[PDB]
Amino acid sequence: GCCPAPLTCHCVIY
Structure with missing residues (x-):
């Protein structure tokens, strides 16, 4: 998964 920021x-x- 990428960033939760996302x-x-x-x-x-x-």
């Missing part, structure tokens, strides 16, 4: 899947905060 943000680009290159950031993925998880």
Whole structure:
């Protein structure tokens, strides 16, 4: 999964 922000899947905060 990408970021929950959500943000680009290159950031993925998880």
